[PDB]
Structure 1
Amino acid sequence: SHRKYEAPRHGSLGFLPRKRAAKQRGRVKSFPKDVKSKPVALTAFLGYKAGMTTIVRDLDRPGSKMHKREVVEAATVVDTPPMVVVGVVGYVETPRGLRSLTTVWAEHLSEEVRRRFYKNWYKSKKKAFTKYSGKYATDAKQVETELARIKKYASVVRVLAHTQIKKTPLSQKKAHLAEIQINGGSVSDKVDWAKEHFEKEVSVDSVFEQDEMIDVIAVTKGHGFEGVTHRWGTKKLPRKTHRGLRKVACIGAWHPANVNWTVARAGQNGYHHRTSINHKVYRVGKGTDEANGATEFDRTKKTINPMGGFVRYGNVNNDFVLLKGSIPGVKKRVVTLRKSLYVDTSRRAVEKVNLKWIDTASRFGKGRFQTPAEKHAFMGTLKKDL
């Protein structure tokens, strides 16, 4: 017999299997399509999710009842110090897909990225990349030969870049190393750009502008093993059900005499790889700016950091990106910011954002002050101040 009443399915079959991600660093599955006419530029950047805050902004959306009126919006802070370019990989078009031809590395690698290649760095002789560094012996013609091979045969050029994790408050010393595809210009232009940027820092302001729409690649929050009620949003069984109620009552018909792959089952929830698109860039802050949290209407000399610091992260002392809404991942997670794969002409994508005010009250409680000066002005002298 049929179901007595129809209802949509619980959960999406396009995010199966609901297993743990193979790596904690989210990987860019697809890069923006290459246009030769554009200038040579990076398509991605690596940052760390610091925390969430609140802003106030005047909306520019004609026909809305909030047009030219203040709206309060959730925002995410991504700590993004400049990345260091250390390598370049060439890919060749084959009838079996892209195939990496050659990887050329820089002469000098910093210690934080050389720790990436070790599980027990403190017990090691740290021999990584010493002979390759010797490949630069007084003529470095091997490197030029490999670069010429890339220029001659590669169709896709990607740079190898790592984060400067010593500039973040994290106690982890391993850098995060990733491939970022180079778009724009000819293959020769891309290879020359990659070589000239070896051991150099590249900032976010050279990759992303304010008001841009970008995508976020990250591994979500882990919740461990979860029952069907919260893993899949299935209906709880009645209170008086024997042997428990946080179940799916019928896990299959008699025939097919198997459990189908489409049936909700208990298992591991979260820690999934996600690609989230259309996040607007409200701010590309600079670490050297002493007025990160200041706007054109709030001239309070104020950093982006809340009072008492971001909870379980610390302070953002680097360049940062302030994105609208929420992005996948947890605090301290490495986040990949990728450029959009299409051209969006909707009013939401082309709106120019001008911020009124950024919340910097404490996130560790019901904070009611934006600044210690404001706090001491409100409360006056305390006993500990003498």
Structure 2
Amino acid sequence: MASIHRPKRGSLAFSPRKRAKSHIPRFRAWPEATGEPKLQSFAGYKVGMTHVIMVDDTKNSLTQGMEISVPVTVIETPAIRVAAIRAYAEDSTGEKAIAEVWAADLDPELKRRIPIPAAGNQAEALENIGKLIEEGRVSDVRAVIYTLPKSLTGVPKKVPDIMESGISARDLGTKFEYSKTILGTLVSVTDVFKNGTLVDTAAITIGKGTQGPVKRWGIQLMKGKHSRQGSLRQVGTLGAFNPSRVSWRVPQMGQMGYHQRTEFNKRILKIGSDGEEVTPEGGFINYGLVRGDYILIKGSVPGPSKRLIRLRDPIRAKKADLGEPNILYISRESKQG
């Protein structure tokens, strides 16, 4: 038999396609430190999409210098609290948590997530971590941070979300000093990301529940006469006669969406403080209006509205210093029109 070839339906790069074990994306890698100390990640909540008219500043592009309409995602980004500093020791079996110091004073609504750590050992915990770093038991340092969604109104929840973030510094001592400076403080998104820079966005995608292989993997439907013989939206064959089993690579029904996904190289087009600049007439549908500080991300982002979106400094960015975008018009017309 002389066969016609096709690329495989869907990607096996995301198998098993199960539901994410948490509603928060977890970062498995952190990029290289390339400058002054700072947090490598922030976290906001997706609001919705709008579009801007901007001058194409992208170097070498055909439309560079002319007016272009660019879709943007609005992400409401209230200040996060640096709740703790955690130290990690590297050994043959990998990284292990070795120490943690919690900030002396923490927000009372953190009790919705965890019983509040007391204002106990912070000075001596920090000196213990300093001794550990001096004696070489510490491989690196991360900052445990959490969001404060109570200030938002389109997100109904008041329980904070907690996550670890890397610190970008040239040396472990510099990392520890910066973490001590930022410990217990409220960091704004301008203290993590700058306008016009590329970032990576992680989020839990839109949940679709249980979906068939046609929607879930993009398999072809039965065609022509076969379309009305009783197996229309349904895979042609589960396998060969031998091997006597259904491969895991055969497209099948199952959970669709509500997965963790990372998008790369999303450009920040605006860091705003007043949500009236971006909120349309009538508000964002099912969300409301922006009230705190916000961010405009060029293009689309994984997740629906109100989903927690984690932003991190780019890990596979190609282009060098991009610049500050020239946003000439932010559309606030009614999205419900």
TM range (shorter): over 0.9
Q: Residue 315 of structure 1 corresponds to which residue in structure 2?
A: 289
Equivalent residue of 1:134, what SS?
coil
User: Structure 1 pair 274/62, CA: closer, same or farther in 2 (3 Å)?
Assistant: closer
Offset at residue 177 of structure 1 (A): 0.9
2:115 pairs with 1:115: no
Partners in 2 of 1:192 and 1:61 — Cα distance? 37
Match of 1:327 in 2: 301
The answer on whether the counterparts of 1:41 and 1:207 sit within 8 Å (CA) in structure 2 is: yes
Aligned to 1:370: none
Aligned to 1:67: 64
Q: Distance in 1 between matches of 2:316 and 2:216?
A: 32
Comparing 73-82 with 107-116, greater Cα deviation is found at 107-116
1:145 maps to what in 2? 128
Give the corresponding residue for 2:236: 249
What is the aligned counterpart of 2:117 among 97, 115, 129? 129
Partner of 1:354: 326
Which residue number in structure 2 is paired with residue 205 of structure 1? 190
Residue 208 of structure 2 aligns to a residue whose secondary structure is strand
Q: Which residue of 2 aligns with 1:93?
A: 90
3-state secondary structure, aligned to 2:96: strand
Once the two structures are overlaid, the 10-residue window that deviates more, 4-13 or 141-150, is 141-150
Count of aligned residue pairs for this structure pair: 333
Query: In the TM superposition, what is the alpha-carbon distance from 1:143 to its structure 2 partner?
Result: 4.6
Tell me whether 1:231 sits opposite 2:255 in the alignment.
no
Instruction: Work out whether residues 277 and 330 of structure 2, in 8 Å CA contact, stay in contact via their aligned partners in 1.
Output: no
Counterpart of 2:207 in structure 1: which amino acid?
G
Q: 1:85 to 1:5 in 2, by over 3 A?
A: same
The one-letter amino acid of 2:29's match is S
Q: What is aligned with 1:297?
A: none
Does residue 53 of structure 2 align to residue 56 of structure 1?
A: yes
State the Cα distance separating 1:285 from its structure 2 match: 0.9
Aligned equivalent of 1:276: 263
C-alpha separation in 2, matches of 1:30 and 1:62: 29
Alignment partners' CA distance in 2, 1:338 and 1:141: 31
> Residue 100 of structure 1: CA displacement?
1.0
Asked whether 1:41 is paired with 2:34, we answer no
Report the secondary structure of 1:13's partner residue: coil
Q: Deviation per CA, 1:137-188: give whole Å up to 9, x if none.
A: xxx4345324433554212110111112111112211101111111114322
Greater mean deviation of Cα atoms: 144-153 or 276-285: 144-153
How well do the aligned residues superpose, as a CA RMSD in angstroms?
Answer: 2.0
TM-score, normalising length: structure 1 = 0.81
1:190 is paired with a residue of what secondary structure? helix
Q: Which has the larger radius of gyration?
A: 1
User: How far off its partner does 1:303 sit?
Assistant: 1.8
Q: Which of 139, 146, 149 is the equivalent residue of 1:165?
A: 149
- Residue 199 of structure 1 deviates from its aligned partner by 2.2
Aligned to 1:8: 7
Query: Equivalent residue for 2:177?
Result: 192
Q: Taking structure 1 as reference, are residues 327 and 237 closer, same or farther at Cα in structure 2, changes over 3 Å only?
A: same
Q: One-letter code of the match for 2:6?
A: A
Deviation at residue 262 of structure 1 after TM alignment: 1.4
**Aligned residue type for 1:279:** K
Give 1:352 shift: 4.0
| Distance of 1:258 and 1:115 partners within structure 2 | 47
Higher alpha-carbon deviation: 222-231 or 160-169: 160-169
AA at the equivalent of 1:129: P
Structure 2 gaps, min length 5? none
> Relative to structure 1, is the Cα distance of residues 315 and 128 closer, same or farther in structure 2, using a 3 angstrom cutoff?
same
Post-superposition offset of 1:64:
4.7
Deviations 1:265-321 (A, max 9, x none): 11111111111100011001124xxxx6xxxxxxxxx52111121112222211211
1:69-109 CA distance string (max 9 Å, x none): 21111100110111111101001111111111111111111
The 3-state SS of whatever aligns with 1:113 is helix
Q: Is the Cα–Cα contact under 8 Å of residues 265 and 317 in structure 2 kept in the other structure?
A: no
Comparing 146-155 and 239-248, the one that deviates more: 146-155
AA of the residue aligned to 1:236: L
Deviation at 1:334, TM superposition (A): 0.7
Which sections of structure 1, spanning at least 5 residues, go unmatched?
Answer: 118-126, 293-301, 367-386
Alpha-carbon contact 1:102-1:150 (below 8 Å) kept = no
Please state whether the residue corresponding to 2:86 is helix, strand or coil.
strand
The percentage of counterpart residues that share the same residue type is: 32
Q: Quick check: 1:23 aligned with 2:22?
A: yes
SS of 1:91 mapped into structure 2: strand
Give the aligned residue type for 1:165.
P
Aligned partners of 1:157 and 1:182 also within 8 Å: yes
Match of residue 304, structure 1, among 264, 278, 294: 278
Separation in structure 1 between the aligned mates of residue 125 and residue 327 of structure 2, nearest angstrom: 52
CA–CA separation in structure 2 for the residues paired with 1:19 and 1:63:
41
Corresponding position of 2:103: 106
Aligned to 1:222, the other structure's residue is in SS state: coil
The CA deviation string for residues 37-88 of structure 1, in whole angstroms up to 9 with x for no partner, is x211110001000110011112135665423221111100110111111101
- Cα gap change, 1:260/1:277 in structure 2, threshold over 3 Å: closer, same or farther? same
SS of equivalent residue, structure 1 residue 332 = coil
